[PDB]
Protein backbone atom coordinates (compact mmCIF):
# COMPACT_ATOMS: atom_id res chain seq x y z
CA UNK A 1 0.00 0.00 0.00
CA UNK A 2 2.43 2.26 1.39
CA UNK A 3 6.56 2.04 0.33
CA UNK A 4 8.29 1.04 4.13
CA UNK A 5 11.65 3.01 4.51
CA UNK A 6 14.54 1.31 5.29
CA UNK A 7 17.38 2.08 7.94
CA UNK A 8 19.62 3.77 7.24
CA UNK A 9 17.04 7.03 6.04
CA UNK A 10 16.90 10.67 7.37
CA UNK A 11 13.06 10.42 8.00
CA UNK A 12 13.28 7.80 10.37
CA UNK A 13 15.67 10.45 12.60
CA UNK A 14 13.37 13.17 12.05
CA UNK A 15 10.91 14.73 15.08
CA UNK A 16 7.66 14.51 13.35
CA UNK A 17 4.73 17.06 13.41
CA UNK A 18 1.58 16.86 15.33
CA UNK A 19 -1.63 15.90 12.85
CA UNK A 20 -3.17 19.19 12.70
CA UNK A 21 -6.76 18.06 12.38
CA UNK A 22 -7.72 14.06 11.97
CA UNK A 23 -9.84 14.24 8.64
CA UNK A 24 -10.46 11.83 6.03
CA UNK A 25 -7.08 12.49 4.29
CA UNK A 26 -5.52 11.38 8.10
CA UNK A 27 -8.05 8.52 7.76
CA UNK A 28 -6.84 7.57 4.78
CA UNK A 29 -3.01 7.25 5.94
CA UNK A 30 -4.14 5.83 8.68
CA UNK A 31 -6.10 2.53 6.60
CA UNK A 32 -3.15 3.11 4.43
CA UNK A 33 -0.72 2.09 6.92
CA UNK A 34 -2.86 -0.74 8.48
CA UNK A 35 -2.57 -2.25 5.02
CA UNK A 36 1.17 -1.90 5.22
CA UNK A 37 1.75 -3.38 8.21
CA UNK A 38 -0.47 -6.58 8.00
CA UNK A 39 1.08 -7.17 4.56
CA UNK A 40 4.04 -6.74 6.05
CA UNK A 41 3.18 -8.71 9.11
CA UNK A 42 4.63 -6.21 11.66
CA UNK A 43 2.61 -5.19 15.01
CA UNK A 44 3.03 -1.71 14.69
CA UNK A 45 3.89 1.43 12.10
CA UNK A 46 4.47 4.96 12.41
CA UNK A 47 3.89 7.48 9.63
CA UNK A 48 7.45 8.28 9.22
CA UNK A 49 8.56 4.68 8.46
CA UNK A 50 6.39 5.44 5.25
CA UNK A 51 7.39 8.72 4.66
CA UNK A 52 5.20 10.89 6.22
CA UNK A 53 6.51 13.25 9.10
CA UNK A 54 3.25 13.18 10.92
CA UNK A 55 2.43 12.01 14.49
CA UNK A 56 0.42 8.85 13.17
CA UNK A 57 0.87 5.16 14.38
CA UNK A 58 -1.18 2.06 13.29
CA UNK A 59 -0.60 -0.89 16.40
CA UNK A 60 -2.30 -4.49 16.44
CA UNK A 61 -0.37 -6.84 18.82
CA UNK A 62 -2.41 -9.85 17.79
CA UNK A 63 -2.39 -9.19 13.98
CA UNK A 64 -6.66 -9.57 13.60
CA UNK A 65 -8.39 -6.45 13.61
CA UNK A 66 -9.85 -7.37 17.20
CA UNK A 67 -7.77 -4.72 19.29
CA UNK A 68 -6.80 -2.46 16.37
CA UNK A 69 -5.11 0.60 17.82
CA UNK A 70 -4.92 4.30 16.29
CA UNK A 71 -2.70 6.78 18.32
CA UNK A 72 -2.37 10.10 16.84
CA UNK A 73 -0.19 13.18 18.48
CA UNK A 74 0.49 10.25 21.29
CA UNK A 75 2.26 11.01 24.31
CA UNK A 76 2.94 9.28 27.15
CA UNK A 77 1.72 10.90 30.53
CA UNK A 78 3.04 8.50 32.87
CA UNK A 79 4.64 4.75 33.29
CA UNK A 80 6.22 2.69 35.81
CA UNK A 81 8.03 -0.81 35.78
CA UNK A 82 10.96 -2.09 34.11
CA UNK A 83 11.14 -4.70 31.23
CA UNK A 84 12.49 -5.58 27.49
CA UNK A 85 12.34 -8.25 25.01
CA UNK A 86 14.20 -8.31 22.08
CA UNK A 87 12.24 -5.97 19.24
CA UNK A 88 12.55 -6.08 15.92
CA UNK A 89 10.20 -3.32 13.28
CA UNK A 90 9.86 -3.27 9.46
CA UNK A 91 12.42 -0.40 8.59
CA UNK A 92 15.45 -3.32 10.14
CA UNK A 93 14.46 -5.90 8.60
CA UNK A 94 16.37 -9.05 9.85
CA UNK A 95 17.60 -7.55 12.79
CA UNK A 96 15.99 -8.03 16.81
CA UNK A 97 17.84 -6.70 20.15
CA UNK A 98 16.73 -6.26 23.43
CA UNK A 99 15.63 -3.11 24.27
CA UNK A 100 14.93 -1.41 28.17
CA UNK A 101 11.40 -0.63 28.37
CA UNK A 102 8.43 0.39 30.90
CA UNK A 103 6.81 -2.25 31.90
CA UNK A 104 3.47 -0.04 32.04
CA UNK A 105 2.63 3.12 30.41
CA UNK A 106 -0.55 5.94 30.60
CA UNK A 107 -0.96 7.52 27.21
CA UNK A 108 -3.00 10.20 25.30
CA UNK A 109 -4.00 10.16 21.86
CA UNK A 110 -6.51 10.83 19.19
CA UNK A 111 -8.10 7.96 17.33
CA UNK A 112 -9.29 7.99 13.45
CA UNK A 113 -11.87 10.05 14.47
CA UNK A 114 -10.34 12.75 16.21
CA UNK A 115 -11.68 11.59 19.58
CA UNK A 116 -9.38 11.70 22.56
CA UNK A 117 -8.71 8.63 24.48
CA UNK A 118 -6.51 8.38 27.75
CA UNK A 119 -5.33 4.64 27.86
CA UNK A 120 -3.18 2.21 29.97
CA UNK A 121 -1.22 -0.14 28.95
CA UNK A 122 1.39 -3.44 29.49
CA UNK A 123 3.29 -6.26 28.34
CA UNK A 124 3.60 -6.23 25.09
CA UNK A 125 0.59 -3.17 23.81
CA UNK A 126 3.11 -1.04 26.22
CA UNK A 127 6.31 -1.64 24.34
CA UNK A 128 4.99 -1.48 21.00
CA UNK A 129 3.33 2.07 22.14
CA UNK A 130 7.13 3.10 23.35
CA UNK A 131 8.30 1.89 19.80
CA UNK A 132 5.81 3.66 17.99
CA UNK A 133 6.44 6.87 19.68
CA UNK A 134 10.29 6.79 19.46
CA UNK A 135 9.40 6.50 15.58
CA UNK A 136 7.58 10.11 16.05
CA UNK A 137 11.12 11.07 17.66
CA UNK A 138 13.02 10.32 15.21
CA UNK A 139 14.54 7.53 17.66
CA UNK A 140 15.07 3.61 16.43
CA UNK A 141 15.53 0.27 18.24
CA UNK A 142 19.45 0.60 17.26
CA UNK A 143 20.08 3.93 18.96
CA UNK A 144 20.04 2.06 21.98
CA UNK A 145 22.86 -0.04 21.12
CA UNK A 146 26.59 0.68 21.14
CA UNK A 147 27.68 3.05 18.10
CA UNK A 148 29.63 0.30 16.47
CA UNK A 149 26.88 -2.49 16.79
CA UNK A 150 24.20 -0.02 15.72
CA UNK A 151 26.97 1.28 12.73
CA UNK A 152 27.55 -2.58 11.64
CA UNK A 153 23.64 -3.04 11.59
CA UNK A 154 23.79 0.09 8.90
CA UNK A 155 26.77 -1.12 6.68
CA UNK A 156 24.32 -4.61 6.29
CA UNK A 157 20.96 -2.99 5.92
CA UNK A 158 22.95 -0.24 3.46
CA UNK A 159 24.31 -3.61 1.28
CA UNK A 160 20.68 -4.85 1.79
CA UNK A 161 18.83 -2.08 0.59
CA UNK A 162 21.21 -2.08 -2.60
CA UNK A 163 20.96 -5.37 -3.88
CA UNK A 164 17.04 -5.01 -3.45
NI1 LIG B 1 9.79 0.24 14.32
Known sequence: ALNVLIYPD???????????????????????????????????????????????????????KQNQFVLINPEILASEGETGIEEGCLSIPGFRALVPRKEKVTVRALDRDGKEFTLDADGLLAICIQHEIDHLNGILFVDYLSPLKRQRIKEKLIKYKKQI
Open 10 to 64: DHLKVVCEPVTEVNDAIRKIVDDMFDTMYQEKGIGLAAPQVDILQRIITIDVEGD
